[PDB]
């Protein structure tokens, strides 16, 4: 029933508290799962706060190296960015054992290199948790504590915990999600679209977001709320997090900010030049994850393409742009009737027949590969839109791109099958992108 703050959290409106890290509370109202009711045992006012800042006092979840249902590979993802050292150390929820745990550790050898090794944590039936049965303890606190004091056989010891990305609430305030332009103050442009402009800016003159405007005449400001209240309930750390929106026009969609700006921008100036080819089979990787949670939930994107992928800290993708090209109208000058869609990018059965689905999504994803794998290569070069559209009819794909792996090639020509019932799930590419590097590694470290 009492709780303690993991974070520091400064006040946006005049209803939320401001705490520090390590202040505790009570909590009074919990309906909205994002926003609590609570009262501070420092000041004893009451008000409300973000419900990820807080933790039940002396759980594992207040842990500060226990990162919760985060996966294996997020996990390495995490343990492997700088500023972590070796030793470096976070424990998570097993994905392969229920009610077991993992612990995951930035380690180092000549074979493997920097990399990342995890144990299984184990609970014997009758009682205790263990690395090795060796040693057994009553409860994970209890033996991370223990391998943080002495290296009881690990490949190190527990040196530090993980350091975390900045947090963010889930959402600008309780019970907010359609909001007055005037709480808005666009502040610096960030790019023009066919469609409208990207701002930075802050709401309530205190919070940075990032704001997406849209042309009048775009989309019906009806028709845009209906789909933002499923978007809404779209939530993955691989799509980009939608705070608000605005739905008189000009409308606004109003997100976190992105710091690196879109996937194919980023590629093309010097550090996405540095990029080696594990890198970004990473971010293909991470991209396919994201397209895996819209197929579980069978959620169409519609545009997915390399320029509605944003690029934030530590080099983290999130999808963007998702849902909304269904909406955008017709004018004079196009002859794409109801739906449009990304010439180079859509699938023949999708550009054609107006069947949208995942499966040309996964078209989508092929093309996308080709984008990222020549690090911001125009898809179909020398090809207009109209001639692209007449060859992919007749199953013309493209050619391997010039320092692009055979296996990688293959799988764009799996996504790229005429048959959409023929291409491989968003789950298999996942599973493959993950796995294309480390294909010899045990799972788990064998200890005794
Ligand atoms: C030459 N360049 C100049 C910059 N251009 C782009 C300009 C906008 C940039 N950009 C775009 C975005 C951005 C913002 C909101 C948004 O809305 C939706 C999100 C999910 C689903 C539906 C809608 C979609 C995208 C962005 C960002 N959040 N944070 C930081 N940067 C951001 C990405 C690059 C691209 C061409
Ligand atoms: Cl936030």
Do not use: L
């Given at each position: 029933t009492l709780f303690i703050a993991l974070y520091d959290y400064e006040a946006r409106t005049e209803d939320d508290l401001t705490f520090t890290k390590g202040e505790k509370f009570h909590i009074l109202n919990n309906t909205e799962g994002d926003w609590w009711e609570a009262r501070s045992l420092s000041s004893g006012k009451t008000g409300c706060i973000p419900s990820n800042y807080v933790a039940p006092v002396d759980s594992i979840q207040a842990e500060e190296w226990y990162f919760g249902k985060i996966g294996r590979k997020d996990a390495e993802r995490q343990l492997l960015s700088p500023g972590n050292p070796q030793g470096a150390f976070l424990i998570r929820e097993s994905e392969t054992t229920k009610g077991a745990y993992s612990l995951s550790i930035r380690d180092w050898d000549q074979?493997?290199?920097?990399h990342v090794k995890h144990y299984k944590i184990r609970k014997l039936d009758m009682g205790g948790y263990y690395i090795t049965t060796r040693v057994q303890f009553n409860s994970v606190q209890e033996l991370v504590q223990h391998y943080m004091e002495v290296n009881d056989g690990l490949c190190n010891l527990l040196i530090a915990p993980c350091t975390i990305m900045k947090p963010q609430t889930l959402g600008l305030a309780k019970d907010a999600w359609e909001i007055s332009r005037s709480s808005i103050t666009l502040e610096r442009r960030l790019g023009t679209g066919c469609f409208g402009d990207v701002w930075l800016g802050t709401w309530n003159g205190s919070t940075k977001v990032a704001v997406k405007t849209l042309k009048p005449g775009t989309m019906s400001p009806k028709a845009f709320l209906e789909e933002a209240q499923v978007m809404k309930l779209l939530r993955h750390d691989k799509l980009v997090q939608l705070y608000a929106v605005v739905s008189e026009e000009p409308i606004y969609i109003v997100t976190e900010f992105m710091c690196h700006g879109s996937l194919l921008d980023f590629l093309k100036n010097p550090e996405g030049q540095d990029l080696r080819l594990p890198q970004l089979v990473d971010m293909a990787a991470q991209v396919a994850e994201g397209m895996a949670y819209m197929e579980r939930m069978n959620y169409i994107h519609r545009d997915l393409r390399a320029a509605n992928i944003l690029v934030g800290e530590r080099l983290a993708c999130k999808i963007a742009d998702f849902g909304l090209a269904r909406l955008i109208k017709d004018d004079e000058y196009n002859p794409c009737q109801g739906s449009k869609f990304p010439i180079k990018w859509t699938a023949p059965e999708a550009a054609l027949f107006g069947r949208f689905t995942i499966k040309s999504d996964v078209w989508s994803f092929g093309i996308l590969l080709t984008e990222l794998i020549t690090k911001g290569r125009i898809p179909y070069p020398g090809m207009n839109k109209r001639e692209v559209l007449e060859q992919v009819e007749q199953g013309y794909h493209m050619p391997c791109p010039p320092g692009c792996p055979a296996s990688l090639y293959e799988a764009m020509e799996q996504t790229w099958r005429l048959d959409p019932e023929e291409r491989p799930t968003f789950e298999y590419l996942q599973s493959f992108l993950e796995d294309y590097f480390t294909s010899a590694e045990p799972q788990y470290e064998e200890i005794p």
């Open positions: 074979t493997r290199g920097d």
